[PDB]
UniProtKB/Swiss-Prot annotation:
Residues that bind Fe cation: 183, 185, 312
Linked pathology: Diets-Jongmans syndrome: An autosomal dominant disorder characterized by varying degrees of intellectual disability, developmental delay, short stature, and characteristic facial features such as a wide mouth, a pointed chin, long ears and a low columella.
Comment on protein domains: Leu-Xaa-Xaa-Leu-Leu (LXXLL) motifs are known to mediate the association with nuclear receptors.
Name of the featured protein: Lysine-specific demethylase 3B
Residues of the full protein shown: 1380 to 1717 of 1761
Ranges for domain JmjC: 121-340
Compartments it resides in: Nucleus
Gene symbol of the encoding locus: KDM3B
Tissue: Ubiquitous. Highly expressed in placenta, skeletal muscle, kidney, heart and liver.
Other facts noted in the record for this chain: Its gene is located in the 5q region of the genome which is deleted in del(5q) interstitial deletion, a frequent deletion found in myeloid leukemias and myelodysplasias, suggesting that it may be a good candidate for the del(5q) tumor suppressor gene.
Species, as recorded: Homo sapiens (Human)
Amino acid sequence: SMTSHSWLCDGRLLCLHDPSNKNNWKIFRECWKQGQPVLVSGVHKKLKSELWKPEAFSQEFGDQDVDLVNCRNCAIISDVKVRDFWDGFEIICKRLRSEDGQPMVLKLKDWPPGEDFRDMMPTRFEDLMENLPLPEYTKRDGRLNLASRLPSYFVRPDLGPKMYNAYGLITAEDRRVGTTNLHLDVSDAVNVMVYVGIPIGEGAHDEEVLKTIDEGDADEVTKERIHDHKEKPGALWHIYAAKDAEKIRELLRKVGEEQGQENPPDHDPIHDQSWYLDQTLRKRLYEEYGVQGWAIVQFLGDAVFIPAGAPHQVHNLYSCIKVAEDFVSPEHVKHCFRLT
Ligand SMILES: Nc1ccccc1Nc1ccccn1
Ligand SMILES: [Cl-]
Ligand SMILES: [Cl-]
Ligand SMILES: [Cl-]
Ligand SMILES: [Cl-]
Ligand SMILES: [Mn+2]
C-alpha cells in the first residue's frame, strides 16, 4: 500500500515517500526543528532522465578544461578535458591509470564552476529546481527560505545548485577513504541523487558494496531496499547533530596527536576537511565521547536534507551524479549569524 512516510535508522530518520505532496511540511517540520536530517525518496520519477546521463555531459561539455582529485591519496590531476572524466564514469577500461597501473577512483572538482550551473545548463536547472521536495524551504524565493531576506550580519549561501560527480570506491582498502571528507556548512542543504552508474569490465563487484554498507552501520530496513526492491544504491553518508560538533573536534585533535601531527590545541579538524571517520573512528566516537550519528544510504532519486551546522561525510558505493541546493530555514538561521 502507498503510505505518506516510514522510518529508517531504527526510528531516528524520517523517510517521506511522495516528493511533491503539499502535506509533506506537516510531518517534516517537527523532525527538522529537532536538528535531524530527513530523506525524501522518488525524485528520479519527476525528472527528465535523458538530461542526467554521463554520455550527454561528455557530448555537450567534453572540451572544457578541469581538475580532478584522486580519491585514494588526495592528489590533484591538473588541466585535463572533462571528457577524460565522463568517458571513464561506467567503463573501467577507459579510466585514467595511476603509476601502479590500476584504474583511478576520481572526483570532478568544482564543475560546473562557482555559480555557473544556471548559465551553462538552463534546461537541467529548470528540471531540478521545479522538482525539489519541500519547495517553501528549498526554492530560491520560497516563503520559508530566508536566503534572499537576511542582512550582512548573516553568511548567505552562493547561488546554486552545485553538481557533485565522482567514481565509486572499489576495494577493501577504499572502505577507509571518503568521496567527500567530514565537514560542516553554515546553511541548510538538499542533495538529490539524479544518476547511479554501476560499471562493467570489473562488473561483478557486488560483495565489497554489501560489506561496506554492513560495516557502515546501515539499518536492516535500508538493507531490504537492495535485496527486496532492487533499488540502485549510490552513496553511504554519516551525519552528526550540530550539537555534537565540538566533541568530534576533541576526538580528531587526540587522534591527530597520536598520529604525530603537530597542531595548535585550538585548530579546527572539521573546517580542515581532512578526516574520514572509518569503522574504528566511528566506534571510538561512540564509546569514548557518547556520540551517535545517522548512517544513510542514498539510492537513485533520494533527496538528503542536511541541517546547518551538522558535520557530515560521503562515500560513493558506485559512480554518482548528485545535485545540491543550499537554503536558510528559520529553524536553523542561528548557525549563519556572525556574532556571539
Ligand atoms: N505522500 C503523502 C504525504 C502526506 C499526506 C498524504 C500523502 N499521500 C498519500 C497517498 C495515498 C495514501 C496515503 N497518503
Ligand atoms: Cl540546530
Ligand atoms: Cl541544459
Ligand atoms: Cl514545503
Ligand atoms: Cl573532501
Ligand atoms: Mn556538504
